[PDB]
Design a binder for this molecule. Structure first.
Ligand SMILES: *[C@@H]1O[C@H](CO)[C@@H](O[C@@H]2O[C@H](CO)[C@@H](O)[C@H](O)[C@H]2NC(C)=O)[C@H](O)[C@H]1NC(C)=O
Ligand SMILES: *[C@@H]1O[C@H](CO)[C@@H](O[C@@H]2O[C@H](CO)[C@@H](O)[C@H](O)[C@H]2NC(C)=O)[C@H](O)[C@H]1NC(C)=O
Ligand SMILES: *[C@@H]1O[C@H](CO)[C@@H](O[C@@H]2O[C@H](CO)[C@@H](O)[C@H](O)[C@H]2NC(C)=O)[C@H](O)[C@H]1NC(C)=O
Ligand SMILES: *[C@@H]1O[C@H](CO)[C@@H](O)[C@H](O)[C@H]1NC(C)=O
Lengths: 970, 970
């Protein structure tokens, strides 16, 4: 069974006077089981719906035959009643559409001045709803024309004419037109005669007589038309504006009837109409305040509740002005009662009972409407039933421990729990406690307390019992707790956790660190197990680091019971990271660094070491401070020893006795702000290069040697003994040379050079001061008295005089150019001497060839001109014939080889000696022997069977073509 | 309907051979609806329970008529079947009690040596259960005697004599005695002849032949009897002990059958029997392992579950050895399947179906028993019903926001949710999201989504729908967020929170600080509200202190939505308390303090001040520290300027720009370690006191000035010009005097004194060095030539000579003792002089009285002896008579009074002058005038009409009694 919820509710109807329908159907039907009897209210009094009267109840719907205004106007309200409860439908305000005949008094004629406006009232009769107005210039259907001169009001119905003349006279009357659901009716008014006085020929101010009202209250969605009609001479314009904002541009008109099609909450504000002509102005202000019909936000639903519970029914509604939410119970109003609290808002039941069952209604209300929301409260009384939440049937307990056994059945209301051990009914005492929600508490469990525990349940509906079996075991306790420990990094540490338990059961050890479980199977695994038995749970931390410090909880558990002990391990006293490296006090080579502190678990910080780099070019090398060991309580120390014009990043390392710690993040890229150079140019050399010019050369210097901005070289050069110093000022790094030449500077001139650097703010220090000379030129003095003589077939000797010193500088050597007989100078071979010698030897020549020799002189700059020539002829070639009649005699340790001397031909040279290569069986390499005559002796030992003898000639002709003689000993 | 759960279960029966009952009755009945069919199993296969056979099913209970060993001995098991499921009862091991007849083989006679022990076997037959053995020395009922020589075994039953002789011979026989449930049977064995050899007359070792076994496996509650019987000459003692502990003393016997009535788990261990006599010893070892039947811990219950859900039934048991928990479904074994997972432990269903409904049994098993636990799984297929968790019937939304509409009915299985906007069905797109669990997600909601949303639900069971109204409202947003702020203590601060919302609803502001709600109504309230409108919700913190800083969260809420912004306020950068102040480096006046850091939020710590007290005597004053302001990075400064011996507690104060901070907890009660005094005793004085003795008096000198331990005073005293110094050494502070007197020291002797202090380790500094004298004594020289003369009636003058200097010291004055004529020295009046005068005046005397005058001399010590006496007589009294014949004459400004002179009597003195007092009308006080004759002139002005004149006499006799004259002018 359920209470009545509506499917259709009664609507407000507009019944016309000229209706073709004799009945009014106010529809109401609510679904129900059993189907409801339906009562109707009229103005708070109940309608006696007798059969055969004019107010019949046809199917629930109220049918009213032939209504008139003094009998059936009012408010109507459907009440659906079953014996669950009574609900109230929303109110149907039955309004009568009627149009009365016009006012039959003899109205006065209207007198006004010509040239002004005129004011004729309509005086409309009593009506519903709001009429539409036009007037009549004559009989029907001759209306007033619609223009900018005649203005018809839809609020008061009067026609407003701005300026009148004598063509506007006519048969003036009012007219009304109403459009309704079943009929259309219009009715003519009384005759109005208008008379005009003499003409006031002036130009004057506008006078707005049609006033749009001061607080126009609109609902959301109502069409609102404001009116601002003006008198005056001449014709005024009408402007509409918004004072506190701007008009929305979907309906902006320059018309005296401003029409909004749908008024919403953004159109609320202060409005202004302005009339203005050529001679005056008039301003009229007003307001539109937008209100709302109530709509629901949070309503109530059909809740199933137990007897005795706390039920809070919140119910809220939104609308403008904000709705007084009130409550109905079963068609009657519900105030605050003995168990019922209404805060005009939530409905809070203190203790529920079975007389609170019924249809309750949330009603919201303001002056624009009244809305309703129904719910059923079904208060239920139940038997206790243990099929959803019973007592635990087969129960563990420990010896010396605690047991929480609840007995909470699905009972409405809260059942009387009387515990029993078998047949013995348990009473509260010093050991056994029956808490009156149902929970039995037994302290100090032994083996006399095991048994068959039955929880009884009782309310007025019925009874049930649920029976649990208590078994007493041994208690799991830790016999050897893990103690606190203090280690280092890299140490191994076990934590002892033995346990003792009942030997029927099983015992697992779970170790938790800071209430997170231990992952034994991590890659790079640290935690491992030692000494496996059943009841030994020793975790051994292997290669302990900083994340293994914290609280340890060895939980020995069975499936029924758990016991835990506490251990606290602290691993390293960490030389940790400092944070926020702040660079202060920026100087030339002096810079201030400040940092944060580290950590002090085992030990406080012993020292701070300081590091720097030039990023990204340079790396981390240790820089110097004063004091040279930074003391460990100092968060700031100042650092020296810097080389400027590089960017820098600074980090700091904390240290302890447990190892030098990992460093911090470096600081910001701080800029050096120098004012001085201090590094001299190195690698200074001078002299040489171009002839006649002073060229000084030196090394390039990179970024660590230059110091600062505006870098270049100051090379200072002057003549030895001169009183004038010349200074070169060239910027850049690539200019590693300077050339000075002048018309008064000759070759071999001594100069004094030194070099320093410069920057934007100073001059550099001095280099090595040395005396250099200007470079020499190529010579012009030829060699004299060149005489040549051949000494062999491939060598000749060329001699020349030691010549005088040239004007172009320093002579260093001589150059020999030579070519054959009949050849030229362009195919010559050029052989230079190693020094200033008066003679040299031309070697590598052909035999019997005449040569032409020219001697030139050279130095470092170039080669001078040629000498007068000399001629020489090489010696004859050696003879290609072998020596004849070769004989040999052996001995016990020697071999003597004799031969005839060589007689040459006419084109061959003489032989003054012989050379011989000798190879035997015991050696793989030949040996050289020399002689001056035609016989020789060589040692041959007794193991040699045969030998290889090659005989060639030597002398002034050169080495000849050798023979090859094979000598067998036996 | 429900499956079968058992009420009675089949017990294992022991059916004897001599039973009076022709049947066995293994009972099995389970409660059911529809009622269960009971099948039976025997040796792993089913019993064909035909009617009319020997295996009848009477009511579910199996009745077997006339059982024998080869036909019906086995394992019986009841199966209760309904079409919910099938359960299996636990096994009834039907074992038979039987006693077979004895061995009919011709057994051999037992032969051993006399003087030894002998073992006669029983050879017991096949039997069940465990027999009780007694024996036969003769025919029945002549048994063996029970003593400490015949030993009765229960495991093997053989005969054990410790020492035999020839009186133990006879026709030996075994016997057995079994006690059963329905019968008692005892049968007789074969005859045994005992023959013995010649006697081995020796004393030898014990020999335990009857050995208690190597692992005796006991259950919990079984009675265990071990056996240790020994041979030997003489008869040995039998001791039982536990090897790994001690025996429990409730059953300790010095008997060869160790008897435990109930073996529990504390008897598990190794056991030891020791046989020992006068000539040898024997030891044997064994063990008792206590095992257990399985009992349950966590079982399974009757669970209704939805189709398609995940279900985990855990099931665990306790017992030794630990039970292989396996599963039965419907009387058949249940392995791991496609949806059913068995881990031999918990049972996991992946996806349920309707074919998984049935009775499931959980079976625990070892070698000591098998236990069962039944449960029902009822897989429910349900229609979707929205009567318990519907769709929200009236849904509010924000424009531009977000809504989640869940559709989760009570449906088995998970229903198909297909949302609709009325009749238009909803497809997933980029704006509307229909999730497969049922939640409809609409982002960026405008007023085209306002509608009548219907959730649909579909499975194979049925169709249901629930319908919700979506209304589209404007979003609550914050137009002016609260910004972060930086203040001081004592500054006022307003956090702006303007909101914007639709005008139908109401807008409340909840301000939460660090997710705790702000209490405006605290005593000493700081948070107040400013500038009240509807949508303006700014909070103003007034007198803001240090707990008002943190995360502020302004939450504008309606009842349908919320909007929150964050503001962070920092209030003061505190000079907080430093914690754990540590005193190091304990010296004399130098002491080292180290403390912790504070806070640096606004500003860091500018300075540290150090204060101290001496508790409970001294208070908090600022002590001096080098350096004179402690810098803000310094946690350690050295503090000086202390006064020693005293206990101290040192407190530290941090300070900054924002005020002098709250001071810390002070340190420990630290004690300095001084060894030097530096304060001389002040206020030094000498002289006076006792006569003839040198007494030095000075100020007692308190414990803030005394410095070190072992305190006392060194007073150094010597004679002026003496070469010997005397030094006093008195400890204690109350001795403020020292007396030196000697036989060679006379009065008026000069002395030189100075004082210093001492302690345990040194001497104090010098005081003021002054020359004092020894104190004088009382004199002995009398005054000489005392002469007296009266000068008036009340005065006389006593003169004496200036006497010489006494031997007792210094004279300072004189003392006059005087009494009347006839009186004595004991009632005399004593008048002392103020110095060394030669004359003094005794005044205050009576007229006409003779006096006796004695003059003594005095000083500071005492008064010396008397002089020779002198006598003097005072003169006559003044006359008491008034002056007669008083006449007066007035003038313009004066009054002259004349009188006769006074003629005295013979006992009265003469009158040489007059004194008078005058009082008039204009003055309230009298005025005194003097005259030397018998007339006087007084000034009387003209306004005085009455005068008061009193006239008395004066002279050498004294002032007389006045008269009283009243003078009237007119
Ligand atoms: C029920 O209530 C309505 C409203 O109070 C009554 O209607 C009014 O009747 C008088 C006289 O006929 C009119 O002047 C009012 O203008 C009516 N007001 C409205 C809002 O219609 C009605 O008469 C009451 N019914 C009865 C039977 O008295
Ligand atoms: C056993 O102990 C409980 C707890 O001490 C008792 O419960 C209290 O009963 C009174 C009266 O109903 C309540 O006002 C208390 O609040 C209860 N205490 C708690 C903690 O719930 C209980 O009454 C005792 N049983 C008997 C039979 O006396
Ligand atoms: C509407 O959106 C949801 C969420 O994106 C879609 O649900 C997913 O469907 C597939 C196929 O069943 C699942 O594998 C995913 O896990 C689902 N996502 C989530 C978050 O649960 C849904 O299919 C979409 N609707 C339609 C009609 O396409
Ligand atoms: C214990 O620690 C040391 C140092 O870390 C290590 O060398 C050693 O191998 C560790 N012991 C074991 C058993 O791993």
């Amino acid at each position: 069974t359920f209470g009545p919820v509506f499917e259709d509710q009664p609507l407000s109807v507009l019944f016309p006077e000229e209706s073709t329908e004799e009945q009014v159907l106010l529809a109401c039907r609510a679904r129900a089981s059993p189907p409801a009897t339906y009562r109707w209210k009229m103005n708070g009094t109940e309608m006696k719906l007798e059969p055969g009267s004019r107010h019949q109840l046809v199917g629930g719907n109220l049918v009213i035959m032939n209504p008139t205004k003094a009998q059936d106007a009012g408010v109507y309200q459907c009440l659906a009643s079953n014996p669950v409860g009574t609900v109230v439908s929303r109110e149907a305000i039955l309004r009568f559409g009627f149009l009365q005949e016009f006012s039959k008094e003899e109205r006065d004629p209207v007198k006004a001045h010509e040239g002004w406006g005129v004011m004729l009232p309509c005086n409309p009769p009593a009506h519903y709803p709001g009429l539409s107005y036009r007037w009549l210039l004559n009989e029907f259907p001759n209306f007033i024309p619609t223009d900018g001169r005649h203005f018809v009001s839809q609020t008061t119905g009067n026609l407003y004419i701005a300026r009148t003349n004598a063509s506007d006279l006519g048969n003036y009357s009012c007219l009304a037109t109403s459009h309704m659901d079943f009929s259309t009716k219009s009715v003519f008014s009384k005759f109005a005669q208008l008379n005009l006085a003499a003409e006031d020929t002036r130009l004057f101010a506008p006078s707005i007589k049609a006033r749009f009202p001061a607080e126009t209250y609109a609902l959301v969605g109502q069409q609102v038309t404001l009116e601002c009609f003006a008198f005056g001479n001449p014709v005024p314009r009408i402007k509409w504006r918004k004072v506190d904002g701007s008009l929305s541009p979907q309906w902006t008109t320059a018309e005296p009837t401003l029409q909004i099609p749908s008024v919403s909450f953004e159109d609320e504000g202060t409005y202004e109409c302005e009339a203005e002509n050529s001679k005056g102005r008039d301003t009229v202000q007003g307001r539109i305040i937008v209100q709302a019909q109530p709509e629901w936000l949070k309503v109530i639903s059909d809740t199933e509740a137990d007897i005795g519970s706390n039920l809070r029914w919140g119910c809220a509604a939104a609308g403008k002005p904000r709705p007084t939410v009130r409550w109905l119970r079963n068609g009657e109003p519900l105030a605050s009662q003995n168990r019922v609290e209404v805060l005009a808002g939530d409905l809070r039941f203190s203790k529920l009972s079975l007389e609170d069952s019924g249809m309750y209604q949330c009603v919201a209300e303001n002056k624009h409407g009244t809305i309703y929301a129904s719910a059923e409260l079904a208060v239920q009384a139940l038997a206790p039933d243990f099929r959803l939440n019973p007592v635990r049937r087969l129960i563990p307990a420990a010896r010396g421990g605690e047991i929480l056994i609840p007995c909470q059945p699905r009972a409405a209301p809260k059942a009387v729990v009387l515990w029993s051990k078998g047949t013995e009914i348990l009473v509260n005492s010093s050991r056994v406690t029956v808490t009156p929600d149902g929970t039995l508490i037994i302290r100090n469990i032994s083996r006399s307390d095991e048994g068959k525990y039955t929880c009884f349940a009782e309310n007025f509906m019925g009874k049930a019992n649920s029976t649990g079996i208590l078994s007493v075991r041994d208690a799991t306790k830790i016999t050897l707790a893990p103690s606190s420990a203090d280690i280092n990094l890299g140490d191994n540490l076990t934590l002892q956790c033995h346990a003792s338990h009942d030997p029927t059961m099983d015992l697992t050890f779970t170790w938790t660190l800071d209430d997170f479980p231990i992952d034994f199977d991590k890659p790079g695994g640290h935690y491992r197990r030692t000494n496996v038995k059943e009841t030994i749970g020793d975790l051994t931390i292997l290669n302990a680091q900083l994340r293994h410090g914290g609280k340890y909880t060895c939980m020995a558990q069975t499936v029924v019971d758990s016991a835990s002990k506490e251990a606290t391990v602290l691993v390293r006293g960490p030389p940790g990271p400092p944070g926020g490296v702040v660079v202060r006090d920026i100087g030339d080579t002096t810079i201030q660094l400040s940092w944060s502190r580290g950590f002090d678990n085992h030990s406080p910080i012993a020292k701070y070491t300081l590091q720097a780099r030039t990023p990204p070019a340079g790396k981390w090398k240790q820089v110097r401070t004063n004091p040279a060991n930074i003391e460990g309580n100092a968060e700031t120390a100042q650092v020296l020893g810097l080389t400027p014009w590089m960017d820098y990043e600074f980090r700091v390392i904390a240290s302890n006795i447990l190892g030098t710690g990992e460093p911090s993040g470096p600081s910001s890229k701080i800029r050096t702000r120098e004012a001085a150079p201090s590094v001299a140019p190195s690698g200074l050399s001078g002299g040489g290069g171009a002839p006649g010019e002073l060229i000084v050369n030196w090394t390039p210097m990179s970024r660590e040697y230059q110091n600062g901005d505006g870098f270049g070289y100051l090379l200072s050069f002057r003549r030895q003994g001169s009183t004038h110093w010349q200074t070169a000022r060239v910027p850049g790094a690539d200019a590693q040379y300077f050339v000075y030449s002048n018309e008064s500077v000759r070759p071999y001139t001594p100069f004094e050079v030194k070099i320093r650097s410069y920057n934007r703010r100073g001059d550099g220090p001095e280099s090595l001061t040395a005396l250099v000379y200007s470079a020499e030129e190529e010579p012009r003095v030829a060699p004299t008295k060149v005489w040549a003589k051949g000494v062999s077939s491939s060598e000749m000797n060329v001699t020349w005089e030691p010549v005088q010193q040239d004007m172009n500088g320093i002579l260093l050597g001589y150059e020999i150019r030579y070519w054959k007989a009949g050849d030229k100078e362009a195919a010559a071979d050029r052989v230079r001497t190693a020094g200033l010698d008066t003679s040299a030897r031309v070697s590598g020549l052909h035999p019997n060839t005449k040569y032409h020799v020219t001697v030139r002189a050279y130095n470092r700059a170039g080669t001078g001109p040629a000498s007068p020539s000399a001629n020489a002829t090489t010696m004859k070639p050696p003879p290609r014939r072998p020596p004849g009649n070769i004989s040999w005699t052996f001995s016990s340790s020697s071999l003597s080889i004799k031969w005839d001397p060589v007689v040459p031909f006419r084109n061959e040279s003489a032989v003054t000696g012989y050379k011989m290569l000798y190879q035997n069986d015991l050696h793989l390499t030949p040996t050289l022997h020399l002689t001056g005559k035609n016989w020789i002796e060589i040692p041959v030992p007794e193991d040699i069977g045969h030998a290889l003898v090659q005989i060639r000639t030597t002398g002034p002709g050169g080495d000849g073509i050798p023979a090859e003689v094979h000598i067998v000993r036996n």
